[PDB]
Design a binder for this molecule. Structure first.
Ligand SMILES: Oc1c(F)cc(-c2cnccc2-c2ccc(N3CCOCC3)cc2)cc1F
Length: 289
C-alpha cells in the first residue's frame, strides 16, 4: 500500500541509521524494479495510533506531498504489527550539524535555505499540512547542498515539541495554524544568523513564558532587511504575522531579504547551494596521493 505497492523481499537492509520513540530507521537498497540498486531510508513504526475501531496509519499524509525540498514517500507496506515507509536517503547531514560547527551562517547562506524552506512550507500549506516541530534537525541536506524537510513534523491543520521553536499560540495551546510555521521560520532564521535562540531561559517553563511576553532586542549585526523580516515574523497575534494574509507566502517572497532570490531558478535547483556537504561514500572519506 501507500504511494507505491511493495514488499519486504524487494529491499536489502544495510545499516540502522538511528532509533527513536517513533520507530526505527534503516538504510536499504532496492533490489527489484527499474530503480534497482537505489538507496533509501526505511522508517518502520510499531502499529501506535488507532481510531474509529480501525488502526489508522496517519502516515498517509505523504501521499500528496511531492516537492523538490520535501521528502517523498516512494513506497510503503505494513507487516505483522509494523508499518514500513521508504523515503529519500539524504547524505549531506542535518543543518543542525553544520550550525554546530560554523556557529552562524552568512546572510546569503541563510537566505538560500530559508527560501527553499519557504517553498516547502507553502506546498504543505497548499495541502492543509502544518509542520509541528520545525527544528534544524528536520532540515536535511542532499549531497548537492539543497535541503529536504523530513516528514516527522507533518500533521493536518483542521501536546509536545521543542519549546524554543514553538509559537505563542501553541504555547497557550490555542491551536496550530499555518501562521505558527512562519514563527518557527522566524526562529530558524534568528538562530542561523545569531547562533542563538531568540527565546531561552533557565528551563522549559521560563522559555515558554518568554515566548509569550518577553520583548526581544534585535541583534544589530543583522542587516535592515533581516531585522525587518524577523520583526514581522515575530508577532504574537498569528493574524498579523507575515505569511498569514491574503497573498500567503508571497508576503515572505517579496521581502527585501529575499530580493536577490530567483524563485523559479531556486525551485529548479538551478541556483547553486552555498555549501556542499560530506558523504559516507568513499569519494569524500578517502585520502589521496
Ligand atoms: O522519516 C525520515 C526518516 F525516518 C529518515 C530520514 C533520513 C534520510 N536520509 C538520511 C538520514 C535520515 C534520518 C536518519 C535518522 C533520523 N533520526 C534518528 C532517530 O531518531 C529520529 C531522527 C532522522 C533522519 C528522513 C526522513 F524523512
Amino acid at each position: 500500500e501507500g504511494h507505491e505497492k511493495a514488499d519486504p523481499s524487494q529491499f536489502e537492509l544495510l545499516k540502522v541509521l538511528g532509533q527513536g520513540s517513533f520507530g526505527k530507521v534503516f538504510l536499504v537498497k532496492k533490489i527489484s524494479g527499474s530503480d534497482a540498486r537505489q538507496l533509501y531510508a526505511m522508517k518502520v513504526l510499531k502499529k501506535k495510533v488507532r481510531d474509529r475501531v480501525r488502526t489508522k496509519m496517519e502516515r498517509d499524509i505523504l501521499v500528496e506531498v511531492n516537492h523538490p525540498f520535501i521528502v517523498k514517500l516512494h513506497y510503503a507496506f505494513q507487516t505483522e504489527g509494523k508499518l514500513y515507509l521508504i523515503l529519500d536517503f539524504l547524505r549531506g547531514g542535518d543543518l543542525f550539524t553544520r550550525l554546530s560547527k560554523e556557529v552562524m551562517f552568512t546572510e546569503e547562506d541563510v537566505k538560500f535555505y530559508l527560501a527553499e524552506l519557504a517553498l516547502a512550507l507553502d506546498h504543505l500549506h497548499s495541502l492543509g499540512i502544518i509542520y509541528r516541530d520545525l527544528k534544524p534537525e528536520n532540515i536535511l541536506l542532499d549531497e548537492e547542498g539543497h535541503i529536504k524537510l523530513t516528514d516527522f513534523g507533518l500533521s493536518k491543520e483542521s501536546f509536545c515539541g521543542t519549546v524554543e521553536y514553538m509559537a505563542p499560540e501553541v504555547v497557550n495551546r490555542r491551536g496550530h495554524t499555518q501562521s505558527a510555521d512562519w514563527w518557527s521560520f522566524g526562529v530558524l532564521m534568528f538562530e542561523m544568523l545569531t547562533g542563538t535562540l531568540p527565546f531561552q531561559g533557565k528551563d522549559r517553563k521560563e522559555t515558554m513564558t518568554m515566548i509569550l511576553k518577553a520583548k526581544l532586542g534585535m541583534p544589530q549585526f543583522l542587516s535592515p532587511e533581516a531585522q525587518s523580516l524577523l520583526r514581522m515574523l515575530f508577532k504574537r497575534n498569528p493574524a498579523n504575522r507575515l505569511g498569514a494574509g491574503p497573498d500567503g507566502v508571497e508576503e515572505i517572497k517579496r521581502h527585501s531579504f529575499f530580493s536577490t532570490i530567483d524563485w523559479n531558478k531556486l525551485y529548479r535547483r538551478e541556483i547553486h547551494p552555498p555549501f556542499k556537504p560530506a558523504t559516507g561514500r568513499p569519494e569524500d572519506t578517502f585520502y589521496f596521493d
